[PDB]
């Protein structure tokens, strides 16, 4: 029957979406963060260059050791190389007296920054306080 | 004079009707026949009312929008147009269908139809899809979706009823008047006159296209339309199944991706149907109730009821024949209202439409939820009663 | 069939809206950004004097070689006109020195401005630091 | 009976007449 | 000789004026004279003085 | 069924509040 074809149609697009969800929640990072001040388990963008790529999904505590376990879904692009000189750093609205940097942060709430290099493999990171110069 | 039930088989004489109530099947209750009422002269003059109602209920502002400083007017052609621009011009061909192409096919069918008495041309397929556009043409959904997102944004923002609401209001109950008095059998049988039979056959078929009984001719055809006449219908329960399946698989994307992106203040907040719900329980949730209803309480018991009707069909299950038939009708009647969620959306993404303080989007999930609607309500439509009646 | 009509004009009317959009889309557009801090995949305006034209349709990166690339379709009665001398930039919501600048831009949206010059033809640019003079 | 259709189509008479009054004239700036 | 403008949300250092334009986006402000008849003006750079 | 379907969704609310539900301390 001509109306069976339907079904495939759906279905074939559901299995097409099901690869696109696996492509952009492509694999799951651990961060150990100082203080995630303010890191949405739901949406918290993950920028290369202010390019959103990551996601965050999890949000823990390591048994209360001052340290926050984030897990965060990047996606295939990246992750083909994603190294282990991999930098994350948190960017937040800070608006102290000595820096007032952090306009983009304040429209846009708080975000990942990252920046790779030339390791060899890692998936369990540990942030860095600031932003590092790149050149 | 005798007819035979399109939902039982009930072979029954059918007395004189006249214009006080109608006729039902003796056994299993359903609508029939009608007659006398309203005249093909009136409905043209209803169409042609419509036709003059129609631009002026469309163009102009349904409501006038004051928020964070700045008035806007939106209507049904800036949201379906917004739809389309956006990149869901699938899902804007299918909202404007349901709102605003259904009546104009409806005014088109009655013209086309007064015109051919003028003239002489054929006019056998304009009556199928004459009595198969009731259940598309839908206003009275498209007011309550108004409704709803009025009653979302006044909190949001200043409403102030515009010009265009009189008349659309007018064109809505225009539309239900002409829809509730438009009789199709009675136009059958003036158009193309037929004859009854000796009220005792038992051989006589009840075509599905027109709601004509009597024997096929030599070719096998309906003696009144230009449509094959069999027992049932060709491949029922293969349809049923089909679109079934169809509507079980696009459901899940429906709730997974997100289906409104709302850009407050730069950041988006990407929510699909459960987090929306969730939300507006927790704020409006008089208006919630009803949203949760028409949005996803509608179609998974139209899928659980359908699943197993199919399931009683297979098993040959002679218990509850008398309740199955009664949920049918009632999935039947209850199915057309699962589309008011992509009219609330469509008239919410018009009006709040700041450039970055508050900008709502329609995500990529209700194209999914409104071909799983369309495709259950198709599964309703094609799935036969006899078929249920035959399983004992 | 006499029962394929009323979904032949609902095909009818939904391929008339998709060529209505096919239509108004216009000519893809790429430009080598060096950072796209705000660019929207969604939603981003191209605008000349102010008046929108192309929008930004893409957003990939060159396989992380500190490059993106932002596919933009751009109208044709830009398209007539769009020749090899012509610019791009990035307009974000910075502050500068004696008066703050881009406040259109902070209202609207991170942007980019476009100026075309006395070129012959290129479809690939590299987009420029800061926004030049044009007189 | 036809008043009804009557009412709209002096409905739809006085609206397009309200539409034709006020409708405002076009000016070119650059 | 009616004269329009551009009413933008200009906050440079010498002039902080415009906030009904920044609450209400770009506008565009007129004013008319004692002229004969045009239908195609040229827009100037500021907002003259109109007394 | 309706009645049955919202039982559903009440138990699912109930089964959601119960899961985190942690316990209630009292700050001055
Ligand atoms: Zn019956
Ligand atoms: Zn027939």
Redesign the interface.
């Given at each position: 029957?001509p109306?069976?074809?339907?079904?495939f149609?759906?279905?074939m697009?559901?299995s097409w979406?099901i690869w696109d969800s696996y492509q952009d929640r492509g694999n799951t990072v651990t961060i150990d963060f100082m203080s995630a001040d303010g890191i949405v388990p739901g949406?918290t963008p993950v920028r290369?260059?202010?390019?959103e790529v990551g996601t965050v999904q999890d949000i823990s505590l390591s048994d209360d050791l001052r340290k926050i376990e984030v897990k965060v879904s990047i996606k295939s692009?990246?992750k083909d190389?994603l190294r282990e000189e991999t930098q994350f750093w948190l960017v937040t609205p800070k608006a102290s007296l000595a820096g007032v940097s952090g306009?983009?942060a304040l429209?846009?709430?708080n975000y990942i920054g990252m920046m790779?290099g030339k390791g060899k493999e890692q998936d369990h990171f540990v942030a860095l306080d600031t932003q590092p110069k790149y050149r | 004079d005798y007819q035979r039930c399109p939902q039982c088989d009930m072979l029954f004489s059918l007395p004189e009707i006249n214009s006080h109530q109608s006729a039902y099947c003796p056994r299993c209750q359903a609508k029939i026949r009608d007659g006398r009422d309203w005249s093909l002269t009136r409905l043209a003059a209803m169409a042609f009312t419509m036709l003059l109602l129609m631009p002026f209920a469309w163009g102009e502002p349904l409501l006038h929008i004051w928020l964070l400083g700045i008035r806007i007017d939106a209507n049904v052609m800036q949201g379906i147009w917004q739809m389309t621009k956006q990149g869901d011009a699938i899902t804007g061909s299918m909202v404007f269908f349901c709102v605003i192409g259904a009546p104009l096919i409806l005014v088109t069918s009655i013209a086309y139809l007064w015109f051919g008495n003028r003239l002489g041309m054929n006019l056998r397929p304009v009556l199928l899809m004459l009595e198969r556009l009731k259940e598309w043409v839908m206003l009275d959904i498209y007011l309550v979706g108004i409704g709803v997102a009025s009653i979302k944004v006044q909190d949001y923002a200043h409403i102030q009823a515009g010009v265009g609401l009189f008349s659309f209001v007018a064109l809505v109950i225009l539309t239900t008047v002409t829809l509730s008095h438009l009789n199709v059998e009675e136009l059958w049988e003036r158009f193309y006159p037929q004859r009854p039979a000796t009220r005792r056959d038992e051989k006589l078929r009840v075509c599905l296209g027109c709601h004509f009984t009597g024997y096929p001719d030599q070719r096998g055809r309906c003696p009144r339309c230009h449509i094959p006449l069999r027992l049932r219908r060709r491949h029922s329960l293969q349809k049923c199944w089909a679109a079934l399946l169809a509507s079980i698989v696009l459901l899940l994307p429906a709730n997974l991706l997100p289906i409104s992106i709302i850009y407050l203040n730069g950041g988006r907040q990407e929510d699909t149907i459960l987090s929306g719900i969730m939300s507006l329980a927790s704020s409006n949730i008089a208006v919630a109730g009803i949203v949760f209803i028409a949005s996803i309480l509608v179609p998974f018991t139209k899928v659980i009821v359908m699943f197993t009707l199919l399931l009683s069909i297979h098993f040959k299950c002679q218990q509850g024949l008398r309740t199955r038939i009664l949920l049918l009708r009632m999935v039947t009647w209850i199915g057309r209202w699962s589309m008011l969620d992509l009219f609330v959306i469509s008239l919410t993404m018009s009006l709040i439409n700041r450039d970055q303080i508050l900008a709502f989007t329609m995500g990529p999930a209700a194209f999914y939820f409104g071909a799983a609607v369309i495709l259950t309500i198709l599964a309703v439509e094609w799935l036969d009663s006899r078929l249920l009646w035959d399983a004992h």
């Open positions: 029957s109306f069976w074809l339907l079904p149609i759906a279905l697009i559901a979406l949406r290369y260059q202010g390019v692009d990246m190389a306009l983009d429209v846009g709430g790779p | -």
